[PDB]
């Protein structure tokens, strides 16, 4: 038996935009979770329905490792029951979510003098996402009663927007890399 490929998830060179969040299915491996919790560079390590130091003593069918990049003051939205731009239109967790949310500042990697415009998020959406739903549609958002016909304009807005991370932004607008570990009923 081999270790779980958490290195490929946590230490990946590039993360995904939050609207197109990546998911890594983890199976057939052994994982030391309490070593992950003692990692000080993890600015956030919040678990729900389970204490972190108890994960090493439990087995589960599959573990899902979701990762993406958001801004600093959006990290609070990555939790069960949260509302707002990210939790409602980009990445939503169920209310009965069982797992841990891990985040750390990635200003040295995902910020760029002059702006890093590769990371995007959905700003306009008609209804909320279902938990663990990934919406990558780029259809023009209709804000009035007139149809847009795929053309931007008044009451017709492109749904995605770039973050434009700069190294000189405050921590609230600096990039943070997030890894959400969900446990489905690996030990």
């Amino acid at each position, epitope marked *: 038996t081999n270790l779980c490929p958490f290195d490929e998830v946590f230490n990946a060179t590039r993360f995904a935009s939050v609207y197109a969040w990546n998911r890594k299915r983890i199976s057939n491996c052994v994982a030391d979770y309490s070593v992950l919790y003692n990692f000080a560079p993890f*600015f*956030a390590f*919040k678990c729900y329905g389970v204490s*972190p130091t*108890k994960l090493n003593d439990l087995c589960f069918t599959n573990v899902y490792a979701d990762s993406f990049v958001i801004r600093g003051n959006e*990290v609070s939205q990555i939790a069960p029951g949260q509302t707002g731009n990210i939790a409602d239109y980009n990445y939503k967790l169920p209310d009965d979510f069982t797992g841990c949310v891990i985040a750390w500042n990635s200003n040295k990697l995902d910020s760029k003098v002059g702006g890093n415009y590769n990371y995007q998020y959905r700003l306009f959406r008609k209804s909320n996402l279902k938990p663990f739903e990934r919406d990558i549609s780029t259809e023009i958002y209709q804000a009035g009663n007139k149809p847009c016909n795929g053309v931007a304009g008044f009451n017709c807005y492109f749904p995605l927007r770039s973050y434009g991370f700069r190294p000189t932004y405050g921590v609230g607008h600096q990039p943070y890399r997030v890894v959400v570990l969900s446990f489905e009923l690996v030990c």
Partner: nanobody
Amino acid sequence: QVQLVESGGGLVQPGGSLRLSCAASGFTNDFYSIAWFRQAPGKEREGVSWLSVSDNTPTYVDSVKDRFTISRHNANNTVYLQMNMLKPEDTAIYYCAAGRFAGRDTWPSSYDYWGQGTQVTVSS
């Protein structure tokens, strides 16, 4: 009905000690976490110490690692922050925060309940 009563704080010389307390009440179980934030006069609200109550795991930032000691006495349902070897860089308003999760977070927006906040000063 969750109420965070925090007390303590004061003025001490460089190298002195000071203990803050935070009596958490109203929680229905042990699945919550305590964080101690501090706020310099012009700077931001930064976390320094965390305690996940359900699994009794402390966490300290590196600047206070060998100096601060967070702990909880289960009897009076109070979390204490023993601050030793205090430096002028420790001067701030210290807050007690509680979140509905098992773990830690650096963001004040992640914690739903707050103490009144108390002043801690270290003399020059």
